[PDB]
Amino acid sequence: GLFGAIAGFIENGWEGMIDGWYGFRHQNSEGTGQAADLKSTQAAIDCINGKLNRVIEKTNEKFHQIEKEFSEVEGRIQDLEKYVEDTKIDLWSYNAELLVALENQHTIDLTDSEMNKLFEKTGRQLRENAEDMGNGCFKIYHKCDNACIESIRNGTYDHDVYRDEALNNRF
Amino acid sequence: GLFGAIAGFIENGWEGMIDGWYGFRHQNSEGTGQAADLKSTQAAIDCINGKLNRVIEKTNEKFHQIEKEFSEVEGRIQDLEKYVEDTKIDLWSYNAELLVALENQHTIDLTDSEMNKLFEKTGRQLRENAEDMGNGCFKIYHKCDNACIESIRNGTYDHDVYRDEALNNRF
Amino acid sequence: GLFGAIAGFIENGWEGMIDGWYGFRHQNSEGTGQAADLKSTQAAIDCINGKLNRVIEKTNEKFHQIEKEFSEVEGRIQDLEKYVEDTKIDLWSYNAELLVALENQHTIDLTDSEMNKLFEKTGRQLRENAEDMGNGCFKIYHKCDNACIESIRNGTYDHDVYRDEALNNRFQ
Amino acid sequence: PGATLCLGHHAVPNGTLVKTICDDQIEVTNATELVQSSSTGKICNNPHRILDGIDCTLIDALLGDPHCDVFQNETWDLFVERSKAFSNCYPYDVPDYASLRSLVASSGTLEFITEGFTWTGVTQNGGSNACKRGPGSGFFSRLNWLTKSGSTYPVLNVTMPNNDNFDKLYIWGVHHPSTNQEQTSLYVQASGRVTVSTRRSQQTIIPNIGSRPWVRGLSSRISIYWTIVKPGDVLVINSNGNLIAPRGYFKMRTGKSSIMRSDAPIDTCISECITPNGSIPNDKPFQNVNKITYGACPKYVKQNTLKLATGMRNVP
Amino acid sequence: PGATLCLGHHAVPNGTLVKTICDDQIEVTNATELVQSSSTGKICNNPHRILDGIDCTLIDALLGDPHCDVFQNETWDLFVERSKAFSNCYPYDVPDYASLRSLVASSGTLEFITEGFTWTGVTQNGGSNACKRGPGSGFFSRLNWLTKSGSTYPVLNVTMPNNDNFDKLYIWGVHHPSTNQEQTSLYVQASGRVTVSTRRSQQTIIPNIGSRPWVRGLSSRISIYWTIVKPGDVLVINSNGNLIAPRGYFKMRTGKSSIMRSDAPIDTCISECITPNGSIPNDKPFQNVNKITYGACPKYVKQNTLKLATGMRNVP
Amino acid sequence: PGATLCLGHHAVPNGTLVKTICDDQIEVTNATELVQSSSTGKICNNPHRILDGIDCTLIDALLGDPHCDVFQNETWDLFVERSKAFSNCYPYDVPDYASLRSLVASSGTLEFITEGFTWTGVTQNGGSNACKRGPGSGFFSRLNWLTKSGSTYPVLNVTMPNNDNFDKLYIWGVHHPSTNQEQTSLYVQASGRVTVSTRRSQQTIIPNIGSRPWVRGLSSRISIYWTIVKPGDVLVINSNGNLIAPRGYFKMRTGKSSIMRSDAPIDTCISECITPNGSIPNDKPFQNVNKITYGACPKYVKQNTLKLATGMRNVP
Numbered sequence A, B: 001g002l003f004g005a006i007a008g009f010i011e012n013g014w015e016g017m018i019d020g021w022y023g024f025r026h027q028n029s030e031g032t033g034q035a036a037d038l039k040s041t042q043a044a045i046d047c048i049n050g051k052l053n054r055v056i057e058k059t060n061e062k063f064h065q066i067e068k069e070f071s072e073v074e075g076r077i078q079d080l081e082k083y084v085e086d087t088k089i090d091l092w093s094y095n096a097e098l099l100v101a102l103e104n105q106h107t108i109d110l111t112d113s114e115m116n117k118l119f120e121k122t123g124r125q126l127r128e129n130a131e132d133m134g135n136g137c138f139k140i141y142h143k144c145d146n147a148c149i150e151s152i153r154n155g156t157y158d159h160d161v162y163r164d165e166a167l168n169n170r171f
Numbered sequence C: 001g002l003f004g005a006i007a008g009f010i011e012n013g014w015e016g017m018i019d020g021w022y023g024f025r026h027q028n029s030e031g032t033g034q035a036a037d038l039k040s041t042q043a044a045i046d047c048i049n050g051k052l053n054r055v056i057e058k059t060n061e062k063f064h065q066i067e068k069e070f071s072e073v074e075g076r077i078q079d080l081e082k083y084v085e086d087t088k089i090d091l092w093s094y095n096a097e098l099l100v101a102l103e104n105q106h107t108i109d110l111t112d113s114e115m116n117k118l119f120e121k122t123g124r125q126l127r128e129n130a131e132d133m134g135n136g137c138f139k140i141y142h143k144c145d146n147a148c149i150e151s152i153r154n155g156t157y158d159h160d161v162y163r164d165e166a167l168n169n170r171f172q
Numbered sequence D, E, F: 001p002g003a004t005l006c007l008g009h010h011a012v013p014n015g016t017l018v019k020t021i022c023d024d025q026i027e028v029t030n031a032t033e034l035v036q037s038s039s040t041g042k043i044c045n046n047p048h049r050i051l052d053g054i055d056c057t058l059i060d061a062l063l064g065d066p067h068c069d070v071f072q073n074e075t076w077d078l079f080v081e082r083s084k085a086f087s088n089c090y091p092y093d094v095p096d097y098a099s100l101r102s103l104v105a106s107s108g109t110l111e112f113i114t115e116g117f118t119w120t121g122v123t124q125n126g127g128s129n130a131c132k133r134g135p136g137s138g139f140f141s142r143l144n145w146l147t148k149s150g151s152t153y154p155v156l157n158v159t160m161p162n163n164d165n166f167d168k169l170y171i172w173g174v175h176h177p178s179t180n181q182e183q184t185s186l187y188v189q190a191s192g193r194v195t196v197s198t199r200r201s202q203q204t205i206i207p208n209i210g211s212r213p214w215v216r217g218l219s220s221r222i223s224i225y226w227t228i229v230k231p232g233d234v235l236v237i238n239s240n241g242n243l244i245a246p247r248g249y250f251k252m253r254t255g256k257s258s259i260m261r262s263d264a265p266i267d268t269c270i271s272e273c274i275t276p277n278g279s280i281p282n283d284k285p286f287q288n289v290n291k292i293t294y295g296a297c298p299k300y301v302k303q304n305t306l307k308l309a310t311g312m313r314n315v316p
């Protein structure tokens, strides 16, 4: 994708994440664990189900039309009848092809983006208390128990509390 | 948006900013103030105005065409005339729907982008003399009067002048 | 572009880069040099050549169609034939116009993206041992000979080796 | 001591390959098909009112071929013509056959209203052993074969005003005898001629003497014509022989009705979209079953499959 | 001490809702309408030359119905036919009416040039009380009703070469008498024929006797036909009765001319785009007013509104 | 000391301008043209089979105008009609000329099979100095001009069953004499009539006596008609004068064949796509050469150039 996170600095997806599209894994003095991120997941999901339907309208309802198969040779008028349909079909065939190409590119790019926003947001909370290890992981330079991890995930982490300690381990 | 600045880490827009699309707010030892950023504002505006016109050309000029309403039932030929116009209208109706969808998405993402590019540009000038607070604000770790603020906005800020002072203050 | 690298914080391109789309220039105690980045380059090239062909299929094959020029006035039926062809041409003309507009924007944004990603990836290897100078160049705060430069370019640089030396120089 | 916090995304054991602007094939976690490519093979009889033509074409039902008279006064949303249909009455042709078929189908009804025409000095209700009705000789139910009475066939001159607020469809015909002997035996005049007109329209037909290929015992033919008469207008019929008279008029309607050719069986089930192959679901935006459709239907495309990604890139 | 530096973007008290790829409805600071949905209700008389048909159809003007003779030799960019139009001359029909109306409308002129045809042995300038011109009998101005002279009607045979460098349109006709008595009284022959030809085309018409519904006192009719003669080509007219002769030819033109049905009044104002509803602005790319249009016009679509975002996300 | 590591991208000394969503003109390192705007000016004879009509139209070849008989039994993928073409046989017209031309072009062959029609009591093989074949009088090769025998022209009545497993195309005609003297001299009857039919079709034509413009010595005309007969069906021909009889039938085919008007020379070279201007390459997706095309062809668009970027922004 355009942002280089998914299939990028994030080395692979987690088959073990079954309650969300995006989330966190940690290791600390109390062991390891995993948690989904709800905001990014719902943001991606909400954009995604509605998309075929926003474009292409509802179906159109059509009734009596023109004949499209013929049992006798007729010449000029049938030629035109056949040409009109052939013309219609080719244009619609083009529309379908282009539509799916564009939508799928945007779907891949939008999911990549949501991952990246979460990464930067997590990073920004950590301030000077962590370093980007380059593989989508942050090394946190202070003791950070289960409650500390949870404060980051729910967005209430207070960088100032740990700054003296964190700077101390780093420097 | 894809970049996560507008309606993202920037919590909201400024209704009081009436002379630009993007700009700066500050607090320092001399008080507070506000100024628009001209380059970012103009980049978004320039892409946005001429944009309906890049695609669909000029209007087409058309004159004598086919009849599209009929006062008598005629069967086959009226069917074809009616089918041809109906076919044309649904295709154009499709083009119009898709066009505004793509354009508006692109307008939202590009405007988000201009915000993000400006943020990254400001950050890079400040180097090690500031930190990203995560809400589109920089904490500047040295005394920074009005002329100092103006130096950042116009792109001539010299990080080296303050580096000793700032590092001292940060750590 | 959307990412602000090409025609952005990278001030201009290198006419002297003739063996790649993206790459590295360095300066150290042993002189200067340049190298293409193969991985980014091939990613851009692969998306771009495949692009005309992904949409529009192969060409369509058509044979007997309708007449499109006429030597006599005929009225109603000729009118419809001409309207049908004119309608088709105007729709296709729109598709062609829109297609190149969308494709070209995406190529510009995608080339910009590859430049920006390479910059970010390089930055991450360097960790606390370097600083972004803001023009797409990194200042490296330790002695870094040709093999050291090569270790960065080929992705095997070990930031821990240089961290003590580098931190002392940056902050003191 | 410290900690590590890793960001990531999900993946699955096998995803779906899709196409993008940049990839001919790329793996995502999930996708959905946008082209309907299958049918049950049966036409659903709901929600549209389906009329199975069985052994009859729409025109034969219109004219009133006896084995088709079951369809008298019927209505439909969709008339279904079967490939096994056959004619079993007087051999006929219809100049502009295709247009008449279209306009009745669109009207959506065979509702017929008899009128009290008076035919002075001629014999009414002619029939033929080429067109049996029950055990005896017969003719189209909606048409009236007029011949001489005694030794003369006078100039017919009859009128029928439209004082109603709907359009009337009159179906009528012209007999083409195979020989001069036939012509004179039936109509006295050596050549007949038929003219039917309204206040703003007119049609004149000259009968044709001669042999055509032998069909059901007969070398003669009827040509079928039609005339629409609007409110406040009036019908006039004038003939001195060879006239195949109307018995009344068909009530015209406008609406969603149409006609389709299909050999699909008709099942009891519900589908908005009907094709000759059978009904198909209309949950998908496109279909590759048939360019011919009726109702609320996906759009026809040439491609037989198109995958829409519904998930992120799959990177196990 | 130190300082703080915040980045931001503008917002407004109320924006516009628009649709995107990712939002069915999302708020931006501003948007602009892309669908023209209104008209003043009047057709602007500039820059295009508008001709109000008033009480006349284009065909009635062409043929020269007396109350329409005001339109003689007129030209137009757009001819406007009114629903109040009526015919007030000899009752007539035009086979392929739609085609003739179209081809005259496209030429954009009624410029007419009289030619010196010679009609030996017939009476010219026939007239009718169905088509009074002042108190007395008269006829279409561009047509010449020929009848017998003395007790005979010879085979007429006249020719007319095209020595100009433009196409000529010839309008001619066929009289259909109501009775055999009338047929022989006018034309002597029991059956007529009219043949008009060029070097690569020919048309032969056989007249029709019989009663039709009374229209303006008359049960007879005229059928109108047309023939185009190219430079270097030639007209030949051959008839032994029932011919309604041309008086000359119409100069044919090519260009931007057309015809429209409308009851909209014609105002003094300027608009490039004309619809039957009235003129509309052409600043927007689309319109939902009418599928029928003339001039430099937005494209017709089904949607009544489409918003193009012209600003960033609105985040108050 | 330390080191510096700079990231960058390439650029080139020229660069090319393209259009985007955001720029009307922006410089990239490279681009490619998507509109084919040129032709060599020659139609390539491969891979499609080209038949150059030279001095002949397809219709003149079909009927067998003597200077066109070189084309007997010929086949083509593309028939090329030249603007310099001319007729040199009996002056004729074809009602619905365009349809016959279309269906033959589509059929893709002039393969002709003589059948042993029997024409009792008439003189066969009529000819004219208007249609010379070598030094003497002649006629269309595929048609048989029947005239009186002795002092009479009897009622012709012939049949031809289709016992083959392909469709037969029959071409036949009707003579329109210039004078009454001519009519009776050739056909004895003062008026002829021709009726040709199948089991579900019929056509009756009445000749029309009178002058048309003088062409190649003749003020008379032939009108050409055609009838297709399917397997198991049958042809019947009935005439008492003015009949131009078939000599046999053309075998109908289906396939990729068509026809084109061009003055382009025919060169030896290979191209899938043919236009009236000459062949064009089909590597680009669009073309601005001609809306008329045949084969595997780019799509016609109005634009004469469209550039697809194939490189990044060019920033020297």
Ligand SMILES: *[C@@H]1O[C@H](CO)[C@@H](O[C@@H]2O[C@H](CO)[C@@H](O[C@@H]3O[C@H](CO)[C@@H](O)[C@H](O)[C@@H]3O)[C@H](O)[C@H]2NC(C)=O)[C@H](O)[C@H]1NC(C)=O
Pocket (backbone or CB within 6 Å): D211, D212, D213, D214, F157, F158, F159, F234
């Ligand atoms: C003109 O020639 C045609 C063709 O020969 C004649 O048509 C033929 O008419 C006879 C007698 O009506 C038909 O005979 C019947 O054939 C059917 C089916 O084959 C058979 O079942 C009957 O028992 C009877 O034999 C014959 O089929 C028919 N031929 C064709 C090709 O249709 C026509 O009678 C001639 N007209 C005149 C006025 O002589």
Ligand SMILES: *[C@@H]1O[C@H](CO)[C@@H](O[C@@H]2O[C@H](CO)[C@@H](O)[C@H](O)[C@H]2NC(C)=O)[C@H](O)[C@H]1NC(C)=O
Pocket (backbone or CB within 6 Å): E157, E158, E159, F178, F179, F210, F211, F213, F214, F219
């Ligand atoms: C009907 O009139 C036309 C025109 O006068 C006659 O055509 C002329 O025929 C002669 C005899 O061959 C030619 O030499 C002339 O060139 C023709 N004149 C024109 C103007 O083309 C035609 O012959 C007449 N028909 C009859 C039956 O008398």
Ligand SMILES: *[C@@H]1O[C@H](CO)[C@@H](O)[C@H](O)[C@H]1NC(C)=O
Pocket (backbone or CB within 6 Å): D037, D038, D039, D276, D277, D288, D289, D290
């Ligand atoms: C539907 O029927 C048509 C007509 O025989 C056939 O060509 C087509 O393949 C059928 N489609 C499917 C999906 O079976």
Ligand SMILES: *[C@@H]1O[C@H](CO)[C@@H](O)[C@H](O)[C@H]1NC(C)=O
Pocket (backbone or CB within 6 Å): E030, E031, E032, E310
């Ligand atoms: C919104 O855009 C329209 C069209 O460009 C413009 O006329 C209007 O002034 C704009 N409004 C604001 C508040 O910018």
Ligand SMILES: *[C@@H]1O[C@H](CO)[C@@H](O)[C@H](O)[C@H]1NC(C)=O
Pocket (backbone or CB within 6 Å): E037, E038, E276, E277, E288, E289, E290
């Ligand atoms: C234009 O007039 C037609 C005819 O009355 C009407 O059906 C249509 O709704 C009108 N359109 C608008 C936009 O008023």
Ligand SMILES: *[C@@H]1O[C@H](CO)[C@@H](O)[C@H](O)[C@H]1NC(C)=O
Pocket (backbone or CB within 6 Å): C049, F030, F031, F032, F310
């Ligand atoms: C420009 O792009 C075309 C299209 O792929 C390619 O064939 C050509 O080699 C390119 N030119 C240069 C100088 O890279």
Ligand SMILES: *[C@@H]1O[C@H](CO)[C@@H](O)[C@H](O)[C@H]1NC(C)=O
Pocket (backbone or CB within 6 Å): F037, F038, F039, F276, F277, F288, F289, F290
């Ligand atoms: C092809 O010929 C037509 C007819 O003269 C001309 O208008 C057109 O410009 C030509 N096209 C090219 C590509 O030369």
